[PDB]
């Protein structure tokens, strides 16, 4: 029992982290097989970030300008290419620590672990959700660029995020491993609107099922609701509309606890309309939305 | 910017996890050098846990009864000994993945990362605080015993906790790596009182300094207090009394933000007496006490 914001074990990812330096800028790279992936903004100077012409800037760079170091080992760069907002540095050595991996583009509302790195060294791991507005509420300082997000299924690492920047609002933006930004963000030092965010409704319900499984039951009530009625409430409180697809994915947690999805929606409706009244749920005083139905089952069943 | 309940990268610890089986019971072991450490309750059956006579039970066991497997590799056990509540299985092979390590007994209020494991396989990592009452509010299921807590300073892993049991109250108890339980707990299936817990005051103040560094400033006020006045309030709200040692350790965060420790105590006093008024601090709706002053500086400075 107990419920924590648990991250995947970062071991398989630590073995891929490298440091990439170009000119005077240093950031993190991801070494998989004979390729090192890093944000293309490694080629910019402080002056360049106002409106960088990445194609022009990369043309001044040669393989020998990209310095790649894995711990105390220097990698020989035999090729470079830009794909969207990432650079792919071909190296002459396959990473001996390359785990089985995939590159995936996660959907908003999904979760993943971030291994925050500086100078190619891992400093910490934490679990995040990709916000509905395609930002992540990370924890990243100068030099954290190139740090990646991921999920692990048995022995396979699905890399889903690479960190590129922090917005003035203190939230984070980045790309999938093909260099495509999540959201409307551009790798330019300009004011960038992150859309209106919403609370991930299916994850809050999943977290309420985790609370029930763990014994925190006070929020359960004698009421039920309908998808239509519940979504009128969700709209008012800036929660994502609940769909039948969300109800279906909540099926296993519904079966585990014997609490029908719409009945759990009625507890959520009452918590939105009345607040927590100074009580807590799983040690939290607000409604948590960073656990998916899959994370809840995994944490409550023990998948390794 | 941003602030997360960040765990250490678990890589160095994943490389030490093994599975230990004795009879029909399986749990996790920690393989460091040529020794495997695991909870001594691995030798008990379901019937034995009422009041186990561990010395008598271990006498029926031979080296060949302890089955130790590291992934797909079987370790040969050449020796066994009980030290307090842990068993130490001497194996004929030094773990090639043994990092530089130490065994430390942490103090209450200190934090550490837990790598939750099942069948010798790591499932997740999360950051914990050792409660003032010597419990940990973990997330652990059947088979999680032998999972360890730790801190990492550059290349050195300081192992501080090994998981042994879950109390009826759903909180967790365990030992240091010499098998000494933290708190009054015994490895017996009996009702066990965990003392009155308290909020770790120095950690809440440290977390308030992290909030200020990150821009969450609304709780700052025009007031100051004294250690005596502040502790009258701390007593009323079951917070640990603040000492000059705590003030001293908060020195760096005081210097960073230019907010004197006693002035930050006055903000904490007002938050305890008036609540949060439906506002949040670092995404939390309650006062967080699982970040030490050291964790705050590390997360806000970027130590790898
Ligand atoms: O290193 C960072 N940025 C460099 C790329 N800077 C850029 C990239 C794209 C567009 C505009 C500017 C950085 C990352 C972060 O998440 N938090 C920070 C906190 C303080 C100082 C810097 C950081
Ligand atoms: O495996 C666990 N215990 C076995 C040792 N059981 C024992 C050990 C010492 C004293 C009395 C009994 C266990 C650990 C945990 O933290 N959460 C659980 C949740 C459900 C089922 C079991 C667990």
At B129, is the secondary structure helix, strand, or coil? strand
Phi, psi of B100 (to 5 degrees): -65, 130
Q: Do B121 and A11 touch (CB under 8 A)?
A: no
Query: Which atom of ligand 2 sits closest to the CA of residue B190?
Result: 11
Q: Name the token pair of A146.
A: 């190139």
**B301/A contact by beta carbon, under 8 A:** yes
How many Å apart are CA A87 and CA A20, to the nearest integer? 11
Catalytic residue among A16, A38, A85, A145: A145
Contact of A168 with chain B, judged by CB distance below 8 Å, is answered with no
Q: Does A65 touch chain B (CB under 8 A)?
A: no
Identify the closest residue of chain A to B3 by CA–CA distance: A139
CB atoms within 10 A of CB A6: 23
**A275 contacts B124? CB cut-off 8 A:** no
For the domain spanning A15-99, the CATH number is 2.40.10.10
Catalytic site residue from B16, B22, B38, B41: B41
Please give the residue of chain A at the shortest CA–CA distance from B301: A141
Q: Is B145 a catalytic residue?
A: yes
Give the separation between CA B234 and CA B200, rounded to whole angstroms.
10
Measured in angstroms, the CA of A148 and the nearest CA of chain B are apart by: 13
| Ligand closest to the CA atom of residue B301 | 1
Structure-determination technique: X-ray
Please give the torsion angle defined by the CA atoms of residues B203, B207, B208 and B210, in that order, rounded to the nearest 10 degrees. Answer: 140
The Cα B153–Cα B89 span in angstroms is 27
How many CB atoms are located within 10 Å of the residue A229 CB? 14
- Ligand 1 centroid from CA B194, angstroms: 45
> Coil, strand, or helix at residue B136?
strand
CA distance A67 to A65: 6
Burial of residue B280, with CB atoms counted within 10 A of its CB: 0-12 exposed, 13-18 middle, 19 or more buried: middle
How far apart, in whole angstroms, are the C-alpha atoms of residue A292 and residue B229? 44
CB-CB contact of A40 with A80 (8 Å)? no
Q: Name the CA radius of gyration of chain B, rounded.
A: 21
Q: Is B2 on the interface with A (CB under 8 A)?
A: yes
Residue pair B32/B17 in contact (Cβ under 8 Å)? The answer is no
- The answer regarding whether domain B198-301 maps to CATH 1.10.1840.10 reads yes
A138: nearest CB among B2, B139, B284: B2
Q: Which two tokens stand for residue B67?
A: 């089955």
Say yes or no for a CB contact (<8 Å) between B284 and A283: no
Nearest ligand to the CA atom of A163: 1
- Please tell me the distance from the alpha carbon of residue A187 to that of residue A201, in angstroms, as a whole number: 30
Give the distance (Å) from ligand 1 centre to CA of residue A45: 12
Which residue from A minimizes the CA distance to B151? A124
Decide: A304 and B147 in contact? Cβ < 8 Å.
Answer: no
Q: Which residues of A touch B274 (CB under 8 A)?
A: none
- Sorted by sequence, the CB contacts under 8 Å of residue B111 that are 6+ apart come out as B127, B128, B129, B130, B151, B203, B290, B291, B292, B295
Whether A302 and B143 lie within 8 Å, measured CB to CB: yes
CA distance A174 to A166: 9
A16 C-alpha to ligand 2 centroid (Å): 35
Domain ranges of chain B: 1-14+100-197, 15-99, 198-301
Handedness of CA B14, B173, A217, A237 (dihedral sign): negative
A12, A28, A108, A145, A202 from A149: Cα distances, Å:
12, 13, 14, 12, 21
Is A22 an active-site residue? no
Residue from A43, A141, A172 whose mutation best tests the ligand 1 pocket (most atoms within 8 A of CB)? A141
SS (H, E, C) chain A: CCCCCCECCCHHHHCCEEEEEECCEEEEEEEECCEEEEEHHHHCCCCHHHCCCHHHHHHCCCHHHEEEEECCEEECEEEEEEECCEEEEEECCCCCCCCEEEECCCCCCCEEEEEEEECCEEEEEEEEECCCCCCECCCCCCCCCCCEEEEEECCEEEEEEEEEEECCCCCEEEECCCCCECCCCCCCCCCCCCCCCCECHHHHHHHHHHHHHCCCCCCCCCCCCCHHHHHHHHHHCCECCCCHHHHHHCHHHHHHHCCCHHHHHHHHHHHHHHCCCCCCECCECCCCCCCCHHHHHHHHHCCC
Q: Are A74 and A68 in contact (CB under 8 A)?
A: yes
Q: Choose the CATH number for B1-14+100-197 among 2.160.20.10, 2.40.10.10, 3.30.70.580, 3.20.20.70.
A: 2.40.10.10
Q: What residues in B contact A121, CB-CB < 8 Å?
A: 304
CA distance B138 to chain A (A): 6
- Inter-chain CB proximity A143 and B302 less than 8 Å: yes
Pocket test for ligand 2, best of B140, B167, B173 (most atoms within 8 A of CB): B140
Tokens for B96, please give them: 């090639």
Resolution in Å, one decimal place: 1.5
* CB-based contact A122 B300, cutoff 8 Å: no
CA of B295 from ligand 2 middle (Å) equals 30
- Is the CA virtual torsion A257, A259, A265, A270 positive or negative? negative
Buried b (16+ CB within 10 A) or exposed e, B101-112: beebebebbbbb
Name the phi and psi angles at B206, rounded to 5. Answer: -60, -45
Residues touching ligand 1 (Cβ under 6 Å) are A 41, 49, 140-145, 164-166, 172, 187-189; B 1
What spacing in Å lies between the alpha carbon of B170 and ligand 1's midpoint? 41
> Which residue in chain A is spatially nearest to B216 when comparing CA positions?
A170
Q: Distance (Å) from the C-alpha of residue B193 to the closest C-alpha of chain A? A: 18
Q: How far is the CA of A287 from the centre of ligand 1 (A)?
A: 30
Cα–Cα nearest to A122, from A97, A100, A153, A86: A97
Is residue B177 within 8 Å of B266, Cβ to Cβ?
Answer: no
- Per-residue tokens: B76: 């040969």
Which atom of ligand 2 lies at the shortest distance from residue B188's CA?
Answer: 10
Residues from chain A that touch B11, judged by Cβ atoms under 8 A, are 9-11, 14-15, 122
What atom in ligand 2 is closest to the CA of residue B140?
16
Å between B299 CA and nearest CA of chain A: 8
Vertex A161 angle, CA A157 and A167, to 5°: 160
Smallest CA separation from ligand 1 atom 2, residue: A142
């Amino acid at each position: 029992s107990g419920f924590r914001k648990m991250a995947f074990p970062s071991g398989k990812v630590e073995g891929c982290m490298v440091q990439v330096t170009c000119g005077t800028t240093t950031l993190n790279g991801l070494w998989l097989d004979d390729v090192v992936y890093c944000p293309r903004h490694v080629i910019c100077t402080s002056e360049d970030m106002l409106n960088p012409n990445y194609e022009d800037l990369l043309i001044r760079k040669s393989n020998h300008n990209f310095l790649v170091q894995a711990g105390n080992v220097q990698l020989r760069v035999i090729g470079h290419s830009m794909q969207n907002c990432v650079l792919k540095l071909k190296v002459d050595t396959a990473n001996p620590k390359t785990p089985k991996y995939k590159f995936v583009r996660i959907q908003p509302g999904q979760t993943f672990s971030v291994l925050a790195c500086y100078n190619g060294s891992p400093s910490g791991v934490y679990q995040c959700a990709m916000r509905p507005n395609f930002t992540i509420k990370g924890s990243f300082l100068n030099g954290s660029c190139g740090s990646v997000g991921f999920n692990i299924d048995y022995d396979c690492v699905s890399f889903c995020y690479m960190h590129h920047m922090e917005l003035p609002t203190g939230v984070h933006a980045g790309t999938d491993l093909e260099g495509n930004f999540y959201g409307p963000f551009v790798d330019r030092q300009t004011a960038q609107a992150a859309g209106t965010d919403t609370t991930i409704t299916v994850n809050v319900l999943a977290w309420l099922y985790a609370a029930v499984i763990n014994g925190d039951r006070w929020f359960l009530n004698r009421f039920t609701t309908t998808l239509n009625d519940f979504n009128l409430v969700a709209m008012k409180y800036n929660y994502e509309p609940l769909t039948q697809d969300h109800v279906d994915i909540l099926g296993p947690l519904s079966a585990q606890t014997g609490i029908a999805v719409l009945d759990m929606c009625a507890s959520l409706k009452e918590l939105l309309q009345n607040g927590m009244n100074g009580r807590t749920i799983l040690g939290s005083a607000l409604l948590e939305d960073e656990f998916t139905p899959f994370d809840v089952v995994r944490q409550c069943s023990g998948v390794t």
